Recover the amino acids of this structure.
């Protein structure tokens, strides 16, 4: 139908602030945010793969794209989480 | 069993994978790529919601509104940098008056 | 011994980076040395190249009586110097009282079961009482003033301050012979400071570094490492050599139990908390 | 009778409106303007409600930011009053 | 219709922008600026509308126009 | 002793904040002192800055016979002053009766197994009987009127009132020597007041503060802390030093059992509830 | 002590209900709670020397089970005027929990004008389940029952009358609160098994009794 990240945003919200809710407008802004960052990272990864004549986007392209797009500490922590998640997933 | 559960995530690995496959980004997508991406998106979401929740609590509100998101983002140097050319609807602006405009 | 971080400056690390390491809380070449690259990089104003230069040049440069006889027998004579001993028990079981007593008994002669060294009390819970130290000192016939003189005291306000005081303790413990390092409510600040749930890994990392520093100081100075834990942890088990379970007997007399020790049996010994002292049980 | 000095109420208004988030242009004239402008690009157009609201949020955000830069230009010239030349300098440097 | 964007409205916008004092000539200038902005965005929005073979401008049309003009808007997806 | 919150006002806390603390129920510098920041912040009209000023300036400023011989022997002579003793048992086992008896026996001479102190009965269940106190007093040859004069009485209507009376008890227990503090149906108000399920953590927090105050008063005044629990809790176990299980024997004679005590064996002793008294079992 | 008129129960109760206190009988359906209430409504009027309280009775019904003819039968059993029993029983049916509590105010003012020894509330807990049947409304029935019980105890202590409430076993505060607890289970026919599961005066003990046309009366196999 019409997809959004709302339920996942809400689960995360419940993780960081168990007794906090969120308005409809604010949720719309969070959805806009997730889609925006998705597009930025996926697009950069696409270009990375193209520049290097590769037909596959792998976690390495995602990671490099993250390093290009995110500033400083955000980049380091994001890289850490992605790596951790892939490691937990693989086994 | 879901992929998100195996990855320790809340964000949807399967959906992210499908969106990668169908977004005309590349002919192929590795198995780890949507896991990594979903993890990154979840991290950033968590950071923003953490700060916004704080702002909501200062305002003695139990619900996060766009204003709290704007306050959280603009008061954080790196988030503000990341979202430098982004407008948050109904976000307003940070309170800020140039010192020269003040009395005395 | 220590290798104050000043010597790292002659290797050609710039002085600003040494100031950044001290701001972070690293005050010795020992401190920079036994850490991976990422610790120095996370510090403001430090790149990966400076961290590699620091690690390379750093690699170039680099039984105490409890005073309760029953507890001494339970421990086979008292705490082994050079190792961490954890006593986990309910609140008011006497962890703080035992710490205050040990802060003086450590200063006792070795022939009396002491270590003939000064004590260090790092408080996180406000329960530091110089008068309790004076009472224990006069009990065992030690100078109460010298106990406070053999106790350098600072209250750790947070986990970072709790770990940072060990760096000051590490540099300070070199100038005087110590036998005891006290961290009271050692786990309380990791719950009060890191109160969120996403920050649990952060408190675990900070606690891990704190524990490594405690073990390091124990092996360096031959001092006893005493930490008190409120149970409203199994991580300490591998780090702690002897786990003692403490529970209250009514009045001022406390029951001690061993609930894990790879060397000591699970067993119990009875002791009391007396105005002067932590002292044998007198039913 | 009481009267506030020039500037006191202005500052009060700055604090007031920087504190809040409500749209500052009236709905109906903005909508009228949007439809007028749109007509010179394409005939027979209709608008989703949220489309007009989107345009207004964007426009007001743009103007507020521009006024921030304009203010910086005025202060640069040791004034406290914004003038058209301030706006024009801001827009030239923005690449507009 | 541009005159419908009144002086007190422009003043409120300037206040949110931190402005304490305002020349009389600002208002007309602001109007011109606003018009240009609106025109550009709307020109693109309608283009999207026309590509979709619709007669109704949607919120998404506007969002895409804004995005492609480097003025990303959150909240209307 | 106590440090009435009035002295906090000279440190430069404004008087309105002290009134807000008293409205919250904090009446001593002791009360503000042993609490974290969040307690004062949750109070209406108190910011985090005022709470930090309060805590900082506060840190600158800051065997009783049961009269049943068999029970005394079970307890090794009677309740230890300075500690909390919990008796959990079915309803009508005599918890309230034992409380009424102790309210008088506490006033007995220490040579008779008393504490030579006044009693405090905080009732939550309506079972307070001045006539029972008069009967126990005449039984042991104590002035029944003085027992009521050595019992300050107020019925706690809720958990907040139950805890608030301890603050009044704490200030009042300073003016007269007490030996016994009675909280009857102590857990009943936490079930009747906090009857929802999402509010369980709230009753646990309020009960925790109440228990800390009870232990504080016991250590401060050397009084016995007696609470009665209806079992239609294990949290009290770490707080309570001696757990006694009470069950009824037919007629007015009750069976007492120890079901946990770190010091006392699990064991049983027989006693009775007599018009005059809680008194030895006479089969 | 108000005599039940069953010797086995009287011995079980050591002579009968204490006036001035609340007595709860929780038991299965058809165990005889209502029958015991009807009997007591008359035995209360018996002389104290006969095990009565020498007071009039109050029957507050919530379940429709009020039978003036049962009062007449109990009265003729014990040799009391059945008509005077109905004349010494003022009767009102509590229509809801609020009306059940509201009847106590009229009962409180009325109990001053005549000497009573017994107050009967039949299916006292039934209206808190039938009226408050939802789950979010549980606190409402518990808070209304709590106030109702406090009024009952006050009236019992005020008039020295017996307070009898009936509980169906298909609040936990009442167990310790009820002064005499009889656990009722059915023996087949009209003969009932009684057990004491709580009593402040009485032992936990059991006694066998029957429900007879005349009376609530001892089991006679």
């Amino acid at each position: 139908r019409k997809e959004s990240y709302s339920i996942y945003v809400y689960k995360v919200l419940k993780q960081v602030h168990p007794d906090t809710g969120i308005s409809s407008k604010a949720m719309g802004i969070m959805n806009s945010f997730v889609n925006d960052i998705f597009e930025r990272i996926a697009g950069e990864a696409s270009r990375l793969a193209h520049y290097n004549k590769r037909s596959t986007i792998t976690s390495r392209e995602i990671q490099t794209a993250v390093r290009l797009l995110l500033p400083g500490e955000l980049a380091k922590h994001a890289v850490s989480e992605g790596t951790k998640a892939v490691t937990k997933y693989t086994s | 069993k879901t992929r998100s559960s195996r990855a320790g995530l809340q964000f949807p690995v399967g959906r992210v994978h499908r969106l990668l496959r169908k977004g005309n980004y590349s002919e192929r997508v590795g198995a780890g790529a949507p896991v990594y991406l979903a993890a990154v998106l979840e991290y950033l979401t968590a950071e923003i919601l953490e700060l916004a929740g704080n702002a909501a609590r200062d305002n003695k509100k139990t619900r996060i509104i766009p204003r709290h998101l704007q306050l959280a983002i603009r008061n954080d140097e790196e988030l503000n940098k990341l979202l430098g050319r982004v407008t948050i609807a109904q976000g307003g602006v940070l309170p800020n008056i140039q010192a020269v405009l003040l009395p005395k | 011994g220590p290798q104050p971080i000043s010597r790292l400056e002659q290797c050609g690390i710039n002085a600003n980076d040494v100031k950044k390491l001290e701001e972070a809380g690293f005050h010795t070449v020992e401190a920079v040395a036994y850490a991976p690259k990422k610790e120095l990089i996370n510090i403001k104003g430090i790149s990966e190249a400076k961290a590699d230069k620091i690690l390379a040049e750093a690699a170039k440069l680099v039984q105490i009586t409890t005073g309760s006889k029953e507890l001494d027998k339970l421990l086979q004579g008292g705490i082994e110097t050079g190792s961490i001993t954890e006593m986990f028990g309910e609140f008011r079981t006497g962890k703080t009282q035992i710490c205050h007593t040990l802060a003086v008994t450590c200063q006792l002669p070795i022939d009396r079961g002491g270590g003939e060294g000064k004590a260090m009390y790092i408080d996180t819970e406000g329960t530091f009482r110089p008068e309790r130290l004076l009472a224990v000192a006069e009990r065992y016939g030690l100078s109460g003033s010298d106990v406070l003189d053999n106790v350098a005291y600072a209250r750790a306000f947070n986990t970072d301050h709790q770990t940072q005081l060990l760096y000051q303790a590490s540099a300070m413990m070199v100038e005087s012979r110590y036998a005891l390092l006290i961290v009271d409510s050692a786990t309380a600040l990791y719950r009060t400071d890191y109160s969120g749930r996403g920050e649990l890994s952060a408190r675990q990392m900070h606690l891990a570094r704190f524990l490594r520093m405690l073990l390091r100081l124990a092996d360096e100075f031959g001092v006893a490492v005493v930490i008190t834990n409120q149970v409203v942890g199994n991580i300490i088990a591998h780090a702690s050599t002897t786990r003692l379970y403490l529970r209250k007997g009514r009045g001022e007399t406390r029951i001690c139990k061993i609930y894990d020790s790879p060397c000591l049996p699970e067993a119990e010994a009875m002791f009391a908390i007396n105005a002067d002292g932590v002292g044998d049980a007198k039913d | 009778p009481h009267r506030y000095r020039p500037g006191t109420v202005a500052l009060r208004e700055i604090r007031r409106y920087q504190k809040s988030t409500e749209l500052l242009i009236r709905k109906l004239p903005f909508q009228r303007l949007v439809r007028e402008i749109a007509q010179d690009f394409k005939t027979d157009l209709r608008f989703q409600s949220s489309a007009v609201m989107a345009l207004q949020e964007a426009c007001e955000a743009y103007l507020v930011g521009l006024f921030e830069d304009t203010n910086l230009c005025a202060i640069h010239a040791k004034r406290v009053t914004i003038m058209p030349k301030d706006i024009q300098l801001a827009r030239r440097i923005r690449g507009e | 219709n541009i005159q419908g964007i009144t002086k007190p409205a422009i003043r409120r916008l300037a206040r949110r922008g931190g402005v304490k004092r305002i020349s009389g000539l600002i208002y007309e200038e602001t109007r011109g600026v606003l018009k240009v902005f609106l025109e550009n965005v709307i020109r693109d929005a309608v283009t999207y509308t026309e590509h979709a073979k619709r007669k109704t401008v949607t919120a998404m049309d506007v969002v895409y126009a804004l995005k492609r003009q480097g003025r990303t808007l959150y909240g209307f997806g």
Remarks:
- The longest strand of chain C covers residues 253-260.
